[PDB]
Amino acid sequence: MDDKELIEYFKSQMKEDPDMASAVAAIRTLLEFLKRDKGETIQGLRANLTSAIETLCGVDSSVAVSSGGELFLRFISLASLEYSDYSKCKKIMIERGELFLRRISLSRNKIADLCHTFIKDGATILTHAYSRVVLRVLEAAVAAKKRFSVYVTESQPDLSGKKMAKALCHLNVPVTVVLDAAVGYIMEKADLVIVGAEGVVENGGIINKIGTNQMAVCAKAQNKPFYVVAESFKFVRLFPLNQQDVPDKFKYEEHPWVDYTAPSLITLLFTDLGVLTPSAVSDELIKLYL
């Protein structure tokens, strides 16, 4: 797997499952790489994994990929290795990686089962754009016999909120595709706003698609509860103050793909570590990284 296969592999892993996240496929590529590396050096593997993660940072431009790379590098190197000839080391590392992958895979379902208790009957959900986590939590909400209307923005650089509305209209829930510049128009009728984030920074703020900040601020001015539903591998060791303080490799005549929402604009988070206030996101994030 001299990096070319890795890029190719990653792609094969992302196109084989369309309902699969990108960072999960990145961690599956890292686990494949460790599984078939053929290097006997407890350190020889760290440099190879770092090069792999920079090829998975170059191929995928998402924040979650680099976050999952750091979390996979920490979680594989956790137990008391004490290897004689790396054989024990590599086997334990592979075991840890598989355990980590399974935890990630059951994370989303945990998110949905822990989050759908906030949607009241007859509520109006406001949603930014397509993410499998908020779609799963809405399918858990409709699984509990609840009736609610969903206004999904379109998110203009790639009309994916329209794709979310297509995938949610098949769920037989009342959905309305709202133009992206109408989030101040429909905030007065949308009582709560559920948005899936793609990256959670240390203070509790979120890194997301370009229209989240204006949506979150419009939710703060109308006192609407802004809920974020994200996994545990989407945590990041960044601390942006402004919208320019996010790194440029996650951003991209001035068409950014990613904004930042302050933790003061966020009511709750729904991670697999629990329903967290943003100061709990800071505590848990530091603890989790370990």
Add this chain to the structure above:
Amino acid sequence: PPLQAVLVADSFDRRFFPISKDQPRVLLPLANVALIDYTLEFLTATGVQETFVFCCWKAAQIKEHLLKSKWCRPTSLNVVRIITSELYRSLGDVLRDVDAKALVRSDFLLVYGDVISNINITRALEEHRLRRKLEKNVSVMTMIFKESSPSHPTRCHEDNVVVAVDSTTNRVLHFQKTQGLRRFAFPLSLFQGSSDGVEVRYDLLDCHISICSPQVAQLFTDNFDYQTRDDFVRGLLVNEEILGNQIHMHVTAKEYGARVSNLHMYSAVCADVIRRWVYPLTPEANFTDSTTQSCTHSRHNIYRGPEVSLGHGSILEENVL
């Protein structure tokens, strides 16, 4: 002394026809809960240690319904005694059966089986015991009433009662119903016998929670034509120079109490239960712990059970169960 109660689980009125020809009116559900459960919950919440259920018509069905309830469990604090006979046919027959069986000991609660209430009677029972210790067994019955305006949909035209009470000692001097009478006649010996004040009361909704004494059963076995409660109080208030036995009264202004007698009381009391006027006895509290009756209380008094599956576009605005 332990507090006893006599529950008449068969209203001998011909009112729920033909509703009552299948199940007796005491098994009639207000909101998924039969009336006998409401009455037993009121008796157990007031603090009654032993009741005597007296069931005449369709009594085997009441027996099969009430044995599997909460009040016949051995873990229940309020023990019940299901007493059925196909011979008695009126309330006076129930109390003369009580005197013949010698069931009560001291100051029981005579109540019908279809009364919805949450009245804590221990203050009124303390007042009754004080009057029994002061007058040396002269005060016989303490009728419990509730303050209510005559315009309330609870009190209907067949059951509106007007009382005349000495308000300083809270005893009943005159008692009559207003069925078919626009004017009300009060005798004058009431004022000449007691010149320490007198007050008329039309604001009293009858709860039928008459606290009684073993002298009540003595008076019911002493006089055969006393068929029901109003016959007893009307024969006791017109006869003072014989069988003196003055009747007292208690009025509650902070607790709910009403019994069902027709469809009108049924609708009014059910609307009061759904609108939570009888807290704690609310349909989400599940005072009868039946697994098929638990509900969730949403806004506008909407009570929803499990596995309801509301359809799309279904609008429930207020007071839905």
